[PDB]
Amino acid sequence: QLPGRLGDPSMSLGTDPRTDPRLAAALTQLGLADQAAEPPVNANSEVADCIAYSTAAEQAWQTLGAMLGSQGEPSNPVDVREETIKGRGGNEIKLYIHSPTGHTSDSDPLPCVVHTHGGGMVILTAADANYSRWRSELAATGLVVVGVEFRNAAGALGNHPFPAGLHDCADAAKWVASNREALGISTLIMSGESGGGNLSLATTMLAKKEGWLEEIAGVYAQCPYISGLYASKPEELPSLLENDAYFLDMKTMGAMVKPYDPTGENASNPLAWPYHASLEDLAGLPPHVISVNELDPLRDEGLAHYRKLLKAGVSTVGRTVHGTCHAADCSFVDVIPDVYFATVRDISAFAYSRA
Amino acid sequence: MSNATLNQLPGRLGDPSMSLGTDPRTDPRLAAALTQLGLADQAAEPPVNANSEVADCIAYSTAAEQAWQTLGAMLGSQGEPSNPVDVREETIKGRGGNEIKLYIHSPTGHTSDSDPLPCVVHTHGGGMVILTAADANYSRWRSELAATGLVVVGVEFRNAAGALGNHPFPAGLHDCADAAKWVASNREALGISTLIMSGESGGGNLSLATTMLAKKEGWLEEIAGVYAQCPYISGLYASKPEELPSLLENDAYFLDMKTMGAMVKPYDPTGENASNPLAWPYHASLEDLAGLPPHVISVNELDPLRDEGLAHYRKLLKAGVSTVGRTVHGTCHAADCSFVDVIPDVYFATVRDISAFAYSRA
C-alpha cells in the first residue's frame, strides 16, 4: 500500500511504521503522536484571526522548545555574546553570537553560520531554548554562529509581514560579511530550518538581487517551508496529503501563511515563497544543501526545490533524514541524539568545506 | 511517494520506459555524464539470470569484472586528494591460513607517535563476487577518506568469482572479520583511536555482516560503529517481493534485476544460506541485531536496492540499535562513491559524513 495517509487515512506519526520508535514514544508522551487537531482558523479566516491564533500558539511552541533544548549543554564550552545592529530601515536587530570559549579576533579564523530560526516566519524567537541550544551545539564543533532576531509576522516580535524578517536576515548577513576580522571568521553560510529554511534560501536570492551574493559561500536549508500552497494541496506535492497532520495540519499552515502575506499578492514571489523561483532567480547561487524530513508534509516541496536548484546550475546536495517528523533532527536531542548530532556535524562539515 | 506526484508513481512504477536519463529525479549533472558514457538508458538484459547454472554465473561475473573495473578507473583515476596521503601494504593471516592483503591509507606524516586518528575498515562493493580493493575508484575513495584525518584500511577479501575467486560465502566475510580483528589488535601500531566498518553495496553487506559476526564471536566491543552505504542485503532479486518496490521502480537503472539474480548464485551456490543473516543481512531477526553499536544506513534514491536498505534501517531501530537513515537524492546506485568529477559536492558530502561519524565514535 501507499505510505502514510495515502494508504491509510487514519495513520498518524504514532502508528506510521516509518517513524523512528524512539521519536514515536517521545511524541506519544508529549501528546504529539496522534493526528494534529483541526485548528480554529484556516486559509479563509480573517487576517486578524490568523495573527491572533499565531500569537496564541507561540507560547505553547516556545514551551515545547524549552523542554527539548534546555536539558543539556554542548560537551565543548561555548561563549554567547549579544550585539545590536541597525537594519536598512533603522530598526534594531539583536544578534546572538556563539563561539568556542577562547575564540577571539586573534585566533585562527573559524567558519561562520548565520542561523535563521523556524516558526513559519510568523512566530518563535532566536532566544528560545531550542534555538540557543542548536547554535551552541554548532559553535561547539568549531564555528562562530550568528543567531538573527528578525521581525516576525505575528507573536511577540510581530506584526511585520513580508519582507520585514527577510530584510532583517539580509542586513544581519551583510553586517557579518563586513565584520569578518572582528568576528574572526573565514567564510559565511546561511542555515536554518522550516520558516528559517525559507529565510536562508530567500536571503541568498536577495543577495543576488542586491549585488552582494559574493559574501555568501553556501546555504544549508533544513525542511524548508517554501511553497505557501497548504490551502491548495497541489498534485505535485504528495507529502502534503501523505503526512498531513503529522505534527502540523494543513489548515494550520494555510492560516499561518496569511500573516506573512495578508493580501496574497506575493504568493508567487520567490523571495516570499522560494518554491516559486524561476531558473533565473537561482543562476549563479553558491552551493546548497537541502535536507528534508521523511515524515514531513513539507518534504516534497523541499525535494522539488532541490531539483530546481540543480536545473539552474547550482551545486546542490539533497538528503532525506529518515524516521523523522518535521524538524525533529533540530530539536529532539534527548530522544534521537544520533540523528540530531548527525545533522549538526553535517552542517559544520559543510561550513568548513566552504572555507 | 517521495519526490513523486499524485498522478504518477515514481520511476518505472509510473512509466515502464523510464530510465536514469529520462527520470525527472536524476541529478542533471549525473544524467549528462551517464548519457555521455552510454549508461543513461535502461541497462541491457544480461545473458545469464537466476535460472542459469552456477558455473555460467561465475563465468559471466568474471567477464563483467573487467568492464566494471575499467568504469571505476574512468571515474576514480583522474585526480588525487587535495591533502597528501601515504599508502602502504600489509599482509595478514586469515583464520583458515590464507593471506589477506590490506591497503592502509593515512595522512602523510601520521605515525605511531602522532595523536591517534579514527580508523575506517573499508569493505568494497561488487556484490561480494567481483572487483578488488586495488581498483582505482576504491583506492581513490580510501585516500579521500584518509585525507580528512583518518586511517583507512582497505580489505582485499576473497571473492565468489573473478580474479579473486572462486570462494563462496563465508570466505569473504571471514577475511573482513579477520582484518577487523587485526586492526583492533594493532591500534597502537596503527595510531588509531576507534574503529568503524564502512562499505557500499556488497561492501555494505560485508560491513553489516562483519559486525553481526563480531557479536556472534564475542569481540563486538572492538567495533565502534558501522556506516553502510546502499547495502546489497536481501538476495531477493529473482523474486521481486512486493515489500521492496524500488526493485521494480529503479530496475535497470545501471543494474538490472536479472544480473543481480545471477550474481547471487556464486556467493551461495547451494542456496542453503538464502535466509542466513550473515550472508543476507536483510533476513536478520531482531535478536540478531540486538546490542549492535551505532549504525548509519545511507541509500541512493534511484537505486533498486533502496528499499531493502531502508527496511534494514527500520529493523535496526526496532532492535534498539542507534541508527541514522539517509537518502542521497538524485543518485543511482553507489553514485556518491564514484562520480567525483561529475557530482563532487555529493561525493564529498558523503566522504565528510563518514569521517565526521568516525570522529564522533572516538
Residue bearing cell 550473515: B278
Would you call A304 and B3 a contact, using CB atoms and an 8 Å cutoff? yes
Would you call A3 and B3 a contact, using CB atoms and an 8 Å cutoff? no
CB B34 within 8 A of CB B21: yes
d(CA B195, CA B180): 8
Note the Cα A318 to chain centre separation in Å.
16
Cis peptide bond prior to B107, omega within 30° of 0: no
Q: Which amino acid does the sequence have at A236?
A: E
The three three-digit cell numbers of residue A13, written as one number: 506519526
The three three-digit cell numbers of residue A242, written as one number: 501523505
Residue-level length of chain A: 355
Q: How far is B219 from chain A (nearest CA, A)?
A: 23
Would you list which residues of chain A are within 8 Å, Cβ to Cβ, of chain B?
Answer: 2-3, 6, 17-18, 20-22, 235-236, 238-239, 241-242, 287, 289, 294, 299-300, 303-304, 306-307, 310-311, 315-323, 338-339, 341-342, 345-346, 348-350, 353
Q: Which chain A residues have a beta carbon less than 8 Å from that of B313?
A: 322-323
d(CA B280, CA B309): 12
d(CA A110, CA A182): 12
Strands B85-93, B99-107: pairing is antiparallel
Q: Which chain A residues have a beta carbon less than 8 Å from that of B24?
A: 307
Bridge partners of B91, per DSSP, are B101
Q: What are phi and psi of B332, to 5 degrees?
A: -80, 175
C-alpha dist (Å) from residue A288 to A121, A136, A174? 21, 22, 19
Residue A82, burial from CB neighbour count under 10 angstroms (0-12, 13-18, 19+): exposed
C-alpha dist (Å) from residue A306 to A141, A309, B189? 27, 5, 45
Q: Which chain B residues have a beta carbon less than 8 Å from that of A342?
A: 296, 324, 326, 353, 357
Q: Which chain B residues have a beta carbon less than 8 Å from that of A6?
A: 1
CA geometry: angle A147, A148, A149, nearest 5 deg: 120
Longest dimension (CA), chain B: 62
Strands B99-107, B151-156: pairing is antiparallel
d(CA A183, CA A104): 7
C-alpha dist (Å) from residue B78 to A242, B30, B136, B342? 44, 17, 9, 11
Parent domain of B90 = 1-362
Q: Which amino acid does the sequence have at A6?
A: L
Residue bearing cell 491572533: A52
Size of interface A-B (CB pairs under 8 A): 102
Bridge partners of B122, per DSSP, are B154, B198
Residue-level length of chain B: 362
Would you call B346 and A317 a contact, using CB atoms and an 8 Å cutoff? yes
Q: How far is B24 from chain A (nearest CA, A)?
A: 8
Would you call B28 and A310 a contact, using CB atoms and an 8 Å cutoff? yes
CB A109 within 8 A of CB A86: no
Bridge partners of A197, per DSSP, are none
Bridge partners of A192, per DSSP, are A116, A221
d(CA B29, CA B31): 5
d(CA B148, CA B127): 27
Going by C-alpha positions, the residue among B348, B126, B121, B105 that lies closest to residue B230 is: B126
Would you call A289 and B349 a contact, using CB atoms and an 8 Å cutoff? yes
C-alpha dist (Å) from residue B216 to B36, B96, B289, B291? 47, 18, 10, 11
d(CA A248, CA A304): 20
Collapsing DSSP to helix, strand or coil, B290 comes out as coil
Would you call A294 and B25 a contact, using CB atoms and an 8 Å cutoff? no
**Measured on CA atoms in the order B22, B23, B26, B28, is the torsion positive or negative?**
positive
CB B310 within 8 A of CB A322: yes
CA atoms within 13 A on the CB side of B179: 34
The three three-digit cell numbers of residue A215, written as one number: 559574501
C-alpha dist (Å) from residue A218 to A111, A214, B2, B346? 11, 10, 25, 14
The three three-digit cell numbers of residue A88, written as one number: 536598512
Would you call A303 and B329 a contact, using CB atoms and an 8 Å cutoff? yes
Alpha helix (H) residue ranges in chain B: 11-14, 28-37, 54-76, 136-147, 171-184, 187-190, 202-217, 246-249, 257-267, 286-289, 306-318, 344-361
d(CA A149, CA A126): 5
In angstroms, this model's resolution equals: 1.8
Q: What contacts B246, CB < 8 A, 6 or more positions away? A: B303, B304, B305, B306, B307, B308
Q: Which of B28, B317, B348 sits opposite A20 (nearest CB)?
A: B317
Q: How many other C-beta atoms can be found within 10 angstroms of the C-beta atom of residue B84?
A: 12
CB B361 within 8 A of CB B194: yes
The three three-digit cell numbers of residue A112, written as one number: 561562520
**Measured on CA atoms in the order B38, B43, B44, B46, is the torsion positive or negative?**
positive
CA geometry: angle A344, A347, A348, nearest 5 deg: 85
Would you call B356 and A338 a contact, using CB atoms and an 8 Å cutoff? no
Collapsing DSSP to helix, strand or coil, B306 comes out as helix
HEC assignment per residue over chain A:
CCCHHHHCCCCCCCCCCCCCHHHHHHHHHCCCCCCCCCCCCCCCCCHHHHHHHHHHHHHHHHHHHHHHHCCCCCCCCEEEEEEEEECCCCCEEEEEEEEECCCCCCCCCEEEEEEECCCCCCCCCCCCHHHHHHHHHHHHCCCEEEEEECCCCCCCCCCCCCCHHHHHHHHHHHHHHCCHHHHCEEEEEEEEECHHHHHHHHHHHHHHHHCCHHHCCEEEEECCCCCCCCCCCCCCCCHHHHCCCECECHHHHHHHHHHHCCCCCCCCCCCCCHHHCCHHHHCCCCCEEEEEEEECCCHHHHHHHHHHHHHCCCCEEEEEEEEEECCHHHCCCCCCHHHHHHHHHHHHHHHHHHC
Q: How many other C-beta atoms can be found within 10 angstroms of the C-beta atom of residue B97?
A: 6
CA geometry: angle A61, A64, A66, nearest 5 deg: 110
Going by C-alpha positions, the residue among A7, A36, A27 that lies closest to residue A254 is: A36
CA geometry: angle B333, B334, B337, nearest 5 deg: 160
CB A196 within 8 A of CB A117: yes
Would you call A287 and B3 a contact, using CB atoms and an 8 Å cutoff? no
**Measured on CA atoms in the order A78, B354, B140, B344, is the torsion positive or negative?**
negative
Q: Which chain B residues have a beta carbon less than 8 Å from that of A321?
A: 324-326
d(CA B149, CA A110): 18
d(CA B65, CA B165): 11
Number of domains in chain A: 1
Q: How many other C-beta atoms can be found within 10 angstroms of the C-beta atom of residue B112?
A: 12
Would you call B27 and A353 a contact, using CB atoms and an 8 Å cutoff? no
Residue bearing cell 534494514: B312
HEC assignment per residue over A113-179:
EEEECCCCCCCCCCCCHHHHHHHHHHHHCCCEEEEEECCCCCCCCCCCCCCHHHHHHHHHHHHHHCC
Q: Which chain B residues have a beta carbon less than 8 Å from that of A300?
A: 2-4
DSSP annotation string for B37-48 = HT-SSPPPPPS-
CB A153 within 8 A of CB A58: no
Q: How many other C-beta atoms can be found within 10 angstroms of the C-beta atom of residue A315?
A: 17
Going by C-alpha positions, the residue among A233, A235, A201, A225 that lies closest to residue A312 is: A201
C-alpha dist (Å) from residue B63 to B48, B58, B59? 12, 9, 6
Q: How far is B83 from chain A (nearest CA, A)?
A: 13
Residue A271, burial from CB neighbour count under 10 angstroms (0-12, 13-18, 19+): buried
Strands B192-200, B225-229: pairing is parallel
Elucidation technique:
X-ray
Going by C-alpha positions, the residue among A116, A113, A138 that lies closest to residue A188 is: A113
Q: Which chain B residues have a beta carbon less than 8 Å from that of A2?
A: 1
Note the Cα B214 to chain centre separation in Å.
19
Would you call B2 and A294 a contact, using CB atoms and an 8 Å cutoff? yes
DSSP annotation string for B74-136 = HHHTT---SS-EEEEEEEEE-TTS-EEEEEEEEETT--TTSPPEEEEEEE--STTTS--TTSH
Residue A6, burial from CB neighbour count under 10 angstroms (0-12, 13-18, 19+): middle
d(CA A19, CA B314): 8
CB A32 within 8 A of CB A247: yes
Collapsing DSSP to helix, strand or coil, B2 comes out as coil
Going by C-alpha positions, the residue among A93, A284, A75 that lies closest to residue A172 is: A93
d(CA A336, CA B324): 9
Using N-to-C axis directions, what is the helix angle for A337-354 and B344-361, rounded to 10°? 130
Q: What contacts A36, CB < 8 A, 6 or more positions away? A: A245, A246, A247, A248, A249, A252
CA geometry: angle B270, B229, B69, nearest 5 deg: 70
d(CA A248, CA A246): 5
Q: Which amino acid does the sequence have at B113?
A: D
d(CA A105, CA B52): 69
- In chain B, the N- to C-terminal Cα span, in Å, equals 38
Q: Which helix (H) or strand (E) holds B227?
A: strand B225-229
Q: Which amino acid does the sequence have at A260?
A: Y
Q: Which amino acid does the sequence have at A99?
A: S
The CATH number linked to B277 is 3.40.50.1820
CB B293 within 8 A of CB B265: no
